[PDB]
Design an enzyme around this catalytic site. Sequence first.
Site, short mmCIF file in Angstrom:
data_model
loop_
_atom_site.label_atom_id
_atom_site.label_comp_id
_atom_site.label_asym_id
_atom_site.label_seq_id
_atom_site.Cartn_x
_atom_site.Cartn_y
_atom_site.Cartn_z
CG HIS A 60 16.90 5.74 11.29
ND1 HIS A 60 17.54 6.16 10.13
CD2 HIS A 60 15.75 4.83 10.59
CE1 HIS A 60 16.87 6.15 9.36
NE2 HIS A 60 15.82 5.22 9.40
CG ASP A 90 12.56 40.64 4.68
OD1 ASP A 90 12.67 40.55 3.62
OD2 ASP A 90 13.67 41.57 5.53
CD1 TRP A 125 8.96 6.45 15.36
CD2 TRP A 125 8.66 8.40 16.09
NE1 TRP A 125 7.85 6.84 14.54
CE2 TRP A 125 7.54 8.06 15.12
CE3 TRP A 125 8.48 9.65 16.70
CZ2 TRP A 125 6.60 8.98 15.00
CZ3 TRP A 125 7.43 10.48 16.63
CH2 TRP A 125 6.49 10.10 15.49
CB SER A 152 12.00 25.31 17.22
OG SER A 152 11.81 24.03 17.08
CB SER A 153 7.38 22.77 15.73
OG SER A 153 6.98 22.61 17.23
CG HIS A 228 -2.34 10.25 11.04
ND1 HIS A 228 -1.95 9.36 10.46
CD2 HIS A 228 -3.20 11.27 10.54
CE1 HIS A 228 -2.25 9.40 9.03
NE2 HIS A 228 -3.09 10.78 9.14
CD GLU A 230 5.54 15.86 13.00
OE1 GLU A 230 4.61 16.90 13.71
OE2 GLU A 230 6.62 16.14 12.60
CE1 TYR A 232 -2.52 12.13 5.86
CE2 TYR A 232 -2.93 11.62 8.13
CZ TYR A 232 -2.92 11.20 6.87
OH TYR A 232 -3.61 10.00 6.54
CB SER A 243 1.13 22.46 -6.43
OG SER A 243 1.55 23.15 -5.35
CG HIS A 277 -4.46 4.63 11.26
ND1 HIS A 277 -5.07 5.85 10.70
CD2 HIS A 277 -3.46 4.52 11.22
CE1 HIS A 277 -3.93 6.36 10.28
NE2 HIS A 277 -3.02 5.55 10.69
CG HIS A 278 -0.80 5.02 14.48
ND1 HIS A 278 0.51 4.65 13.74
CD2 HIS A 278 -1.14 6.18 13.75
CE1 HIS A 278 0.49 5.44 12.70
NE2 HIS A 278 -0.21 6.23 12.58
CB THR A 303 -5.28 11.58 -0.53
OG1 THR A 303 -5.18 12.05 0.79
CG2 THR A 303 -3.63 11.40 -1.20
CE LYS A 306 -3.15 18.74 -2.51
NZ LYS A 306 -2.43 19.03 -3.88
NE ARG A 428 7.92 -0.86 12.71
CZ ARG A 428 7.27 0.27 12.91
NH1 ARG A 428 6.01 0.40 12.92
NH2 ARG A 428 8.04 1.51 13.33
C1 HEA Z 1 4.60 11.45 5.43
C2 HEA Z 1 4.53 10.42 6.06
C3 HEA Z 1 3.16 9.41 5.88
C4 HEA Z 1 1.88 9.80 5.09
C5 HEA Z 1 1.65 10.81 4.08
C6 HEA Z 1 1.00 8.43 5.39
C7 HEA Z 1 -0.25 8.26 4.87
C8 HEA Z 1 -1.11 7.50 5.07
N1 HEA Z 1 -0.79 6.45 6.08
FE1 HEA Z 1 0.71 6.26 7.26
N2 HEA Z 1 2.41 5.91 8.64
C9 HEA Z 1 3.34 6.73 8.57
C10 HEA Z 1 3.73 7.98 7.61
C11 HEA Z 1 2.79 8.21 6.73
N3 HEA Z 1 1.65 7.72 6.39
C12 HEA Z 1 4.52 6.30 9.54
C13 HEA Z 1 5.94 6.86 9.46
C14 HEA Z 1 3.84 5.12 10.11
C15 HEA Z 1 4.47 4.14 11.09
C16 HEA Z 1 4.41 4.88 12.42
C17 HEA Z 1 5.16 3.90 13.70
O1 HEA Z 1 4.44 3.08 13.93
O2 HEA Z 1 6.39 4.17 14.03
C18 HEA Z 1 2.73 5.00 9.66
C19 HEA Z 1 1.58 4.03 9.81
C20 HEA Z 1 0.58 3.66 9.06
C21 HEA Z 1 -0.49 2.85 9.32
C22 HEA Z 1 -0.25 1.67 10.60
C23 HEA Z 1 0.10 2.06 11.98
C24 HEA Z 1 0.48 0.89 12.95
O3 HEA Z 1 -0.69 0.10 13.32
O4 HEA Z 1 1.31 0.73 13.23
C25 HEA Z 1 -1.63 2.88 8.70
C26 HEA Z 1 -2.88 2.19 8.78
O5 HEA Z 1 -3.75 2.46 8.05
C27 HEA Z 1 -1.27 4.11 7.67
C28 HEA Z 1 -2.15 4.53 6.90
C29 HEA Z 1 -2.05 5.82 6.21
C30 HEA Z 1 -2.94 6.07 5.31
C31 HEA Z 1 -4.26 5.30 4.89
C32 HEA Z 1 -2.33 7.40 4.66
C33 HEA Z 1 -2.86 8.05 3.49
O6 HEA Z 1 -2.67 9.49 3.49
C34 HEA Z 1 -2.51 7.49 2.12
C35 HEA Z 1 -3.50 7.97 0.92
C36 HEA Z 1 -3.06 7.80 -0.40
C37 HEA Z 1 -3.56 7.00 -1.09
C38 HEA Z 1 -4.37 6.06 -0.96
C39 HEA Z 1 -2.69 7.01 -2.74
C40 HEA Z 1 -3.06 8.44 -3.49
C41 HEA Z 1 -4.57 7.99 -3.79
C42 HEA Z 1 -5.09 7.31 -4.86
C43 HEA Z 1 -3.98 6.80 -5.94
C44 HEA Z 1 -6.23 7.16 -5.41
C45 HEA Z 1 -7.37 6.87 -4.33
C46 HEA Z 1 -7.01 5.25 -3.56
C47 HEA Z 1 -7.93 4.65 -2.94
C48 HEA Z 1 -9.23 5.04 -2.66
C49 HEA Z 1 -7.50 3.40 -2.40
N4 HEA Z 1 -0.01 4.68 8.14
C1 HEA Z 2 12.48 11.21 7.14
C2 HEA Z 2 12.39 9.87 7.91
C3 HEA Z 2 13.46 8.59 7.56
C4 HEA Z 2 14.38 8.41 6.30
C5 HEA Z 2 14.88 9.41 5.36
C6 HEA Z 2 15.03 7.07 6.44
C7 HEA Z 2 15.70 6.58 5.71
C8 HEA Z 2 16.01 5.12 5.72
N1 HEA Z 2 15.61 4.38 6.61
FE1 HEA Z 2 14.50 4.68 8.33
N2 HEA Z 2 13.12 4.86 9.59
C9 HEA Z 2 12.51 6.20 9.90
C10 HEA Z 2 12.39 7.08 9.23
C11 HEA Z 2 13.48 7.42 8.18
N3 HEA Z 2 14.22 6.26 7.64
C12 HEA Z 2 11.46 5.82 10.89
C13 HEA Z 2 10.83 7.18 11.62
C14 HEA Z 2 11.69 4.51 11.67
C15 HEA Z 2 10.91 3.73 12.63
C16 HEA Z 2 11.94 3.88 13.95
C17 HEA Z 2 11.70 2.78 14.95
O1 HEA Z 2 11.79 1.72 14.48
O2 HEA Z 2 11.28 3.21 15.90
C18 HEA Z 2 12.78 4.02 10.56
C19 HEA Z 2 13.17 2.74 10.60
C20 HEA Z 2 14.00 2.09 9.72
C21 HEA Z 2 14.39 0.76 10.28
C22 HEA Z 2 13.86 -0.28 10.87
C23 HEA Z 2 15.00 -0.51 12.30
C24 HEA Z 2 14.44 -1.58 13.03
O3 HEA Z 2 13.10 -1.68 13.21
O4 HEA Z 2 15.21 -2.50 13.40
C25 HEA Z 2 15.29 0.39 9.10
C26 HEA Z 2 16.07 -0.80 8.51
O5 HEA Z 2 16.72 -1.01 7.62
C27 HEA Z 2 15.36 1.58 8.29
C28 HEA Z 2 16.16 1.86 7.13
C29 HEA Z 2 16.35 3.19 6.45
C30 HEA Z 2 17.21 3.43 5.37
C31 HEA Z 2 17.88 2.22 4.70
C32 HEA Z 2 17.10 4.75 4.90
C33 HEA Z 2 17.76 5.35 3.85
O6 HEA Z 2 19.26 5.00 3.57
C34 HEA Z 2 16.84 5.24 2.34
C35 HEA Z 2 17.59 5.91 1.15
C36 HEA Z 2 18.02 7.53 1.71
C37 HEA Z 2 19.45 7.89 1.67
C38 HEA Z 2 20.63 7.10 0.89
C39 HEA Z 2 19.81 9.22 2.14
C40 HEA Z 2 19.03 10.17 1.17
C41 HEA Z 2 19.61 11.43 1.76
C42 HEA Z 2 18.57 11.88 2.95
C43 HEA Z 2 17.46 11.18 3.60
C44 HEA Z 2 18.78 13.27 3.49
C45 HEA Z 2 18.50 14.46 2.55
C46 HEA Z 2 18.43 15.76 3.24
C47 HEA Z 2 18.15 17.24 2.63
C48 HEA Z 2 17.49 17.06 1.19
C49 HEA Z 2 18.21 18.23 3.53
N4 HEA Z 2 14.57 2.55 8.59
O1 PER Z 3 0.58 7.89 10.09
O2 PER Z 3 0.10 7.27 8.91
CU CU Z 4 -1.28 7.40 11.32
#
Ligand code: HEA
Ligand code: HEA
Ligand code: PER
Ligand code: CU
Lengths: 459, 100, 186, 92, 73, 90, 100, 47, 141
Positions: A60, A90, A125, A152-153, A228, A230, A232, A243, A277-278, A303, A306, A428
């Site tokens: 997943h 193109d 994952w 590919s990426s 991380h 990734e 971003y 935008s 921070h992970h 952030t 924006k 989790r």
């Molecule tokens: C698109 C995906 C995405 C994005 C954008 C982000 C964005 C951010 N993530 Fe996230 N992050 C994940 C995907 C993402 N993350 C995933 C997938 C994990 C779990 C991975 C795993 O463990 O499997 C994770 C995990 C994760 C962790 C925990 C890691 C761990 O211990 O397991 C933390 C801890 O700080 C973190 C922080 C942040 C922060 C600080 C941002 C910042 O970019 C957010 C900044 C945005 C705001 C703050 C809001 C907008 C700003 C304002 C409204 C005004 C200013 C606000 C303040 C000054 C507070 N992320």
């Molecule tokens: C893009 C990434 C992505 C997306 C869409 C989702 C979507 C969802 N995920 Fe998540 N999820 C992850 C990434 C994502 N997840 C990751 C990275 C983890 C951590 C893995 C790990 O534990 O190691 C995780 C873990 C995770 C867990 C924890 C598993 C565990 O620890 O035991 C659960 C539990 O309910 C969950 C639930 C869901 C549900 C209910 C939805 C969705 O059903 C929410 C609603 C969405 C829909 C109803 C579908 C909408 C359509 C699309 C998303 C496709 C659209 C396609 C195009 C537009 C081309 N997710």
């Molecule tokens: O990874 O936030």
């Molecule tokens: Cu991170």
Amino acid sequence: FYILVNNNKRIGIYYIKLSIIIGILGIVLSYIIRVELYNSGNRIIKYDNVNYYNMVITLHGLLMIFYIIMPGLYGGIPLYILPILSVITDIVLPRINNISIIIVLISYIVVINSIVIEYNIGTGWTLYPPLSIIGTVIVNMILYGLIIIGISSIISAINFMNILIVIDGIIYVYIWSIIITSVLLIISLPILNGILLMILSDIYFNSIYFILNGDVVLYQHLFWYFGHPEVYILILPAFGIISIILSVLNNKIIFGMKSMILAIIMISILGSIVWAHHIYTVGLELDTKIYFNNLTLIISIPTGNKIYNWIILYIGSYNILYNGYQSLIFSIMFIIIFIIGGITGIIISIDIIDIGLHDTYYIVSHFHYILSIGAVISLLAGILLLKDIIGYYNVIIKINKYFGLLLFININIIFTPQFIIGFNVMPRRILEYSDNIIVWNLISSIGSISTILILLSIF
Amino acid sequence: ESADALFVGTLDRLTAEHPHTDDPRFAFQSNQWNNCELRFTQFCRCTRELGEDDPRCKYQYYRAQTVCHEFLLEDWMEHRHRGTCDLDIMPDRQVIHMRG
Amino acid sequence: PPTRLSTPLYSEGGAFTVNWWRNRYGLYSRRQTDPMLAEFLFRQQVKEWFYDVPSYNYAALVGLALGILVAVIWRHFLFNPDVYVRRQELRKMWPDRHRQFAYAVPYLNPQLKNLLLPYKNSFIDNEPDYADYNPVGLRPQRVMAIRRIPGFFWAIPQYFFEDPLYTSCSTKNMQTIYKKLGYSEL
Amino acid sequence: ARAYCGRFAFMLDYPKSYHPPRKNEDGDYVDPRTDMLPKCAAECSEWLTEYNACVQRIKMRTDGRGNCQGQYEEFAMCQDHCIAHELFHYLK
Amino acid sequence: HIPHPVKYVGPRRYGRYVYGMNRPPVLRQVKDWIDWTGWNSVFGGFSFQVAFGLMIVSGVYLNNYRATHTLYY
Amino acid sequence: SIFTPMDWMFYYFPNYSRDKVALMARQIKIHFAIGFALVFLVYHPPYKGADYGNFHKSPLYWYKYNQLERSGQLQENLRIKRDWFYDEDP
Amino acid sequence: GRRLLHGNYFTRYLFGSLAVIWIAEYAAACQYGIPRHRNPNWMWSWWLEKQNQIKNGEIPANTPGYAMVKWNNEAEQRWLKTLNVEAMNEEFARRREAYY
Amino acid sequence: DIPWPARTDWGGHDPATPFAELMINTHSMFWPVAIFIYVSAIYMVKK
Amino acid sequence: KHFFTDGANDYVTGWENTPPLKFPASVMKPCDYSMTKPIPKHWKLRGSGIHGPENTDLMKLVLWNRLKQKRPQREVPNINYLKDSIRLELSVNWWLMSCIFLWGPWLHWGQEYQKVHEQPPWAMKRIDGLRGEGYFTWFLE
Ligand code: HEA
Ligand code: HEA
Ligand SMILES: [O-][O-]
Ligand SMILES: [Cu+2]
Ligand SMILES: CCCCCCCCCCCCCCCCCC(=O)OC[C@H](COP(=O)([O-])OCC(O)COP(=O)([O-])OC[C@@H](COC(=O)CCCCCCCCCCCCCCCCC)OC(=O)CCCCCCCCCCCCCCCCC)OC(=O)CCCCCCCCCCCCCCCCC
Ligand SMILES: CCCCCCCCCCCCCCCCCC(=O)OC[C@H](COP(=O)([O-])OCC(O)COP(=O)([O-])OC[C@@H](COC(=O)CCCCCCCCCCCCCCCCC)OC(=O)CCCCCCCCCCCCCCCCC)OC(=O)CCCCCCCCCCCCCCCCC
Ligand SMILES: CCCCCCCCCCCCCCCCCC(=O)OC[C@H](COP(=O)([O-])OCC(O)COP(=O)([O-])OC[C@@H](COC(=O)CCCCCCCCCCCCCCCCC)OC(=O)CCCCCCCCCCCCCCCCC)OC(=O)CCCCCCCCCCCCCCCCC
Ligand SMILES: CCCCCCCCCCCCCCCCCC(=O)OC[C@H](COP(=O)([O-])OCC(O)COP(=O)([O-])OC[C@@H](COC(=O)CCCCCCCCCCCCCCCCC)OC(=O)CCCCCCCCCCCCCCCCC)OC(=O)CCCCCCCCCCCCCCCCC
Ligand SMILES: CCCCCCCC/C=C\CCCCCCCC(=O)OC[C@H](COP(=O)(O)OCCN)OC(=O)CCCCCCC/C=C/CCCCCCCC
Ligand SMILES: CCCCCCCC/C=C\CCCCCCCC(=O)O[C@H](COC(=O)CCCCCCC/C=C/CCCCCCCC)COP(=O)(O)OCCN
Ligand SMILES: [K+]
């Protein structure tokens, strides 16, 4: 022809089509999880078959990130409009563009075939060793997919960077988002390939990097150094789409264009140096933890700029224009949802708070609000904006207020309880849980089944 | 009978009188793996000079147990008994300076 | 920002100036094919980026982040006991690494730790000074701060002498209560 | 000719406040300096390790010759410099 | 790039080779060649090895001889 | 400049900010030094900042302290309210 | 012909960076007071005393370290059964006579 | 100590060590700031 | 120089933004009409006014950039240019000479000394009874 086509616009469609197809498997895997977590005790997975659940969560996560969202936002929309946003005809490297989509498909077939043929076990994952290197051959197959996906990426990143050479117009904000994402891939992918090779070496070449006297934490540093960037890389293309949509649908020039561009650049620079921070709970040095915590908070500054620039784009727009279009609603919904996800990210950036919230469903909800809602809705919003240009039909999504409202309500039902569960606390990657967490898990499960039903209404 | 006597003589003495507290050499880091290796090496050298039966070396083993988990010690003690423990190899038979 | 190519642009001497930027901006450019066109495009870029007021805010942020980044990297190599670059100590067993151990205690007592540790009472409600006393002497004895941390700590009074219950929750009072029962030494 | 060299008060770091000395179980006040000795020894660990080495070297001498006074004086000077910075805070 | 003249000030032609007659001394010829082709390449090429060689071989005095005569124990 | 809108810098210091490219470089350099200085001058220095007897007491501290000292609140606040665990059951 | 980098960039930023690293390290040592004298030897006091005895001639030359300890591992017990230091010294003496 | 049904426990619950209290207080300290950030931004999401 | 740059080191097409300094200004000049005096009001725009080949200087720049590609003889550059073209080659060659004639001799000397004295001549002799060569780079100890 169908496979021999080099037209970038055709290839862009293929990326969107393939992501939807793979999305179904990802949705199925997601649906399996919430059904199991409906209540304590086994529901659809035998206790003797708990290994399958570990594979479900592992796939997943992998499929959704590398095979669904990344191709959709970085391969699908960019390949369609980026050469159009540029004044060029193109894509620069047509043949490379063709092989990139084919590579993605072959890696997908390898992954799903491994489910059917290999024993089903999971390691998350993130593929943390030593668990990843003591597993069965399914782990070997998943590594091949990731390495193949990496090819590919990187070649796609090379393709977009070449637009700077040939662009005959102005570099719009959207073009900047794709370019900077390509830069992140170029610098982060080779590090990922190196560490993945070490995982293969231990799995397949009798290497001893991940046994005693070999620091297992070494993997976490190299992996998250790519991990991380990734996240971003996933979101930055989404920022570019928002935008364009907000400016176009409001007839307002993008405010602070240079501030937007510099914010994207700043995020990438900061995003490349905050990976640890992970790794708060592993026991890093005091000064190391303070550094990463301090720099992680700084990412909010660009952030935030924006976010505010987006808000002023919507403010003051003409009232006569109908505001119920699905693309506009999704773009506005992104701002509301992203703020929730980002704020919770700042909360878990504080390492002492993170001690309690690491490896809990609070982290799950954090990245679902950003990715499962925000990124998906941004991808949906962009596709809807380009409906006339793309030309697809046979769906009712352009003006469908029911779909937007129901999607927003139900996805929030899935993931808001997961914040609460995080403090309760529920770990989790867990199948069974204590009886006193059932209420919140039950509510989220009802949310999951409801969302799937809504998708059937678009057709 | 001096306030700073612990520091005087050796840094070793600090945790010899306070076995369950941090060692000055490794207090800066949460990871105590290097602390365990130093303690075990100290136990190995004690036996060489004084012999196993000596109460001093018996206490040095106890100090190692304070920071080394038993599954590590059992494995390391097995290597020491055979004669393949790299910590306990006699200096004149080391190969660290050979071939570079 | 001039609008006529006849009016020159003021430039300073050094390695980051208008003249320095003009020399290098068009090195990889296919669009700056003649002086008139080259200058027009050069001034277009300079006007758009360097005359944008909000852009300077990001310049400050990158400087600060990079400055911290370089300092932390350098500090680890120079001072962290666990980081080895020279090989003299790595060729000896752990008990013999006397030179490396010299870094331990000073690296354990940075200035900022001493300044901010006394402010634990802004977070802990009961026995904020539970770990203040340590007879070993590797660190200074801690004394609780007299004011709350500036910023977002409006929950507690500005100064701790304004809190009627602060003294009752100190580790000393709790130790008195439990000693009176024979419950525990601390 | 005179006992001290004068300085501006900002150069002289006179204690701002007074902390009473700790009391023994017997009820007699313990010397502030003795309480500070372990801490200042740690701050002078580098010199102390050099003195500790000298003790071991002279121990392994067949002859009776050997002293470690030079290293001890360097350690003592360092420890006292540490004590001077904080001792008057505990003295009336 | 700052335009600047050619610094070579030695002879520009020795004349036709006639069985090596009427030609400068060999050492002078070597100096002229390096002047003609640039001393900057010589200094840059030799700089790395000179720095490494001096640092390593200086230890014969700094690390070996001095240490024997300077050990307070 | 620190925490300074650069439009003010452009207006009040035209000659200094005449070269914008150079001005941008100084912005980066100045903030780079601050970050570098904080680590090595505020965080790093060992065995410093432990003079807890010299806590800063601002004028606001004394104003509130004297106000409570004049009344009985300061004495009442510092008094230990409870020093026994169990209440006596009648 | 237009230049992008410093005219001597390669040497400037290689030697310059090395110089700054070296000077920074010396400053760091002074601030922390780290001893800068180099010792290439192990610091085990008991072993160094035994080596001095061999140099003085108190212990016969080429005597192994395991022949001098109060506790021997299994591998050392195997070697002690075949150890003949007296024979080894005679063999070395014979070699010297042949060479000269 | 143990999870209980239908509990928000926002920021944590039932600390038993001084460090556990610190974790809860830190979250509560920042929680009002988070609300301010959300409310101030969301209020302006409109035409 | 090795690397290709559109602006300066454009050897793929040979394009140059300005003509040679040899030509008199009357024959050919750099394309700069920034100093053109104000146009009289009674003058009327006949051409497009668009920057392009209608301007004489740009037309001559385009023409020359195509017709310069055939020349009877070489345009010999000065020795400064020739030095710069092979700066890396010459420096790598001198680096090879330094390895053979500087590094080689003292590396050979160290090994011979090491044979007799068990350690390199630039290392402190050990008294701890361990056998072998030991370190090589003394200043990294
Ligand atoms: C698109 C995906 C995405 C994005 C954008 C982000 C964005 C951010 N993530 Fe996230 N992050 C994940 C995907 C993402 N993350 C995933 C997938 C994990 C779990 C991975 C795993 O463990 O499997 C994770 C995990 C994760 C962790 C925990 C890691 C761990 O211990 O397991 C933390 C801890 O700080 C973190 C922080 C942040 C922060 C600080 C941002 C910042 O970019 C957010 C900044 C945005 C705001 C703050 C809001 C907008 C700003 C304002 C409204 C005004 C200013 C606000 C303040 C000054 C507070 N992320
Ligand atoms: C893009 C990434 C992505 C997306 C869409 C989702 C979507 C969802 N995920 Fe998540 N999820 C992850 C990434 C994502 N997840 C990751 C990275 C983890 C951590 C893995 C790990 O534990 O190691 C995780 C873990 C995770 C867990 C924890 C598993 C565990 O620890 O035991 C659960 C539990 O309910 C969950 C639930 C869901 C549900 C209910 C939805 C969705 O059903 C929410 C609603 C969405 C829909 C109803 C579908 C909408 C359509 C699309 C998303 C496709 C659209 C396609 C195009 C537009 C081309 N997710
Ligand atoms: O990874 O936030
Ligand atoms: Cu991170
Ligand atoms: C020194 C030693 C020497 C040794 C020598 C040894 C030599 C050994 C040789 C080794 C090499 C062998 C192969 C050589 C290839 C040659 C290529 C070439 O030149 O071809 C010219 C040739 C030209 O053909 P032609 O003769 O002119 O005739 C073509 C037609 O007339 C009309 O032209 P056309 O091109 O339009 O027609 C083609 C096309 C036309 O048909 C269509 O396109 C149908 C309409 C579309 C319907 C919607 C499809 C879904 C949407 C997909 C969106 C993304 C598309 C991405 C782009 C396409 C990617 C394939 O149909 C197909 O070919 C099939 C299309 C498949 C699309 C797949 C999309 C995703 C599917 C997802 C599956 C989900 C379920 C999961 C489980 C199953 C997993 C497998 O190419 C082709 O057109 C045919 C290619 C066929 C080969 C494909 C091989 C694929 C292998 C996949 C991996 C399988 C491994 C695992 C098995 C698991 C099974 C379960
Ligand atoms: C003590 C040491 C001292 C050392 C001194 C060293 C001195 C070095 C001097 C260097 C001078 C450079 C001169 C050239 C300037 C650029 C000109 C140029 O590109 O011409 C266009 C030229 C195309 O010719 P064209 O026809 O004139 O283009 C027309 C435009 O497309 C049509 O566009 P338009 O007309 O609408 O707009 C014009 C302009 C519009 O854009 C601009 O004008 C941008 C102007 C700003 C650029 C940045 C300047 C530096 C700013 C200060 C940073 C200081 C940091 C200090 C840190 C210290 C820490 C200790 O377009 C472009 O510039 C397009 C290219 C942009 C590429 C950006 C790639 C990402 C880099 C990150 C962005 C910069 C962020 C700076 C920091 C931000 C936060 C404050 O571009 C190309 O040839 C494209 C080649 C693509 C190759 C890609 C693959 C390369 C390998 C990648 C490896 C991994 C890279 C990792 C990067 C990480 C980034 C975060
Ligand atoms: C201690 C003792 C031991 C020492 C060991 C040292 C070990 C060194 C290992 C090096 C391995 C070999 C690499 C080079 C192989 C080729 C050598 C060669 O042919 O040289 C002669 C030849 C000389 O050229 P020429 O035109 O004849 O020059 C004549 C004169 O010299 C005068 O020329 P000019 O001044 O007039 O300028 C013309 C020439 C001048 O250029 C050169 O000649 C280049 C010479 C380089 C030699 C290598 C020196 C070391 C460089 C270190 C760079 C570190 C980057 C920062 C790392 C940060 C880490 C945290 O320009 C070009 O050729 C342009 C080339 C394209 C440059 C593309 C750069 C892309 C990356 C940009 C930065 C990305 C980060 C942005 C961050 C800020 C964001 C706001 O060089 C080339 O033509 C090579 C160009 C093609 C290869 C470029 C490779 C770029 C790689 C970029 C990596 C970016 C990674 C970013 C992320 C990192 C952190 C995650
Ligand atoms: C009473 C008591 C009295 C006591 C008295 C005591 C006396 C003590 C005396 C001490 C003396 C100290 C002197 C200090 C001041 C020095 C002043 C000075 O001249 O500094 C500048 C001087 C030279 O700098 P410069 O002026 O910039 O150079 C001018 C150039 O011509 C600039 O022109 P350029 O830039 O045109 O240069 C050419 C450049 C032009 O560039 C280009 O053409 C463009 C392209 C450039 C990029 C290239 C990219 C890659 C190229 C690919 C090709 C590679 C080929 C090789 C492949 C190898 C494959 C294995 O190309 C190159 O140079 C590079 C290409 C050539 C081949 C590169 C080979 C690889 C290099 C990297 C590795 C280096 C490590 C190797 C280690 C060994 C092997 C593993 O710096 C040094 O010499 C460094 C200072 C060293 C200080 C050591 C201090 C410690 C030692 C003390 C010894 C004595 C102690 C004795 C005991 C005493 C006890 C009392
Ligand atoms: C990684 C190991 C590689 C070994 C390479 C050997 C060759 C040496 C020469 C090339 C490498 C440069 C290092 C030379 C060091 C010379 C002096 C020396 O020995 O220093 C040792 C000393 C520590 O050794 P120990 O005493 O054992 O540890 C004490 C407690 N930590 O090392 C150092 O402090 C220097 C090592 C780091 C040098 C590199 C610069 C560090 C800062 C990097 C900042 C990066 C961020 C971006 C910077 C941008 C700048 C514009
Ligand atoms: C010719 C081109 C050559 C280019 C070469 C580029 C080399 C670098 C490429 C990227 C990899 C960076 C190296 C990896 C650094 C990992 C360090 C690490 O993990 O150390 C942390 C500690 O590290 C830190 O303190 C974090 C510092 C962050 C290092 C980041 C370095 C790479 C940054 C690349 C960002 C992108 C480029 C930015 C350029 C400038 C932008 C303006 C672990 O600490 P503890 O486990 O507690 O152990 C301490 C002692 N036991
Ligand atoms: K269940």
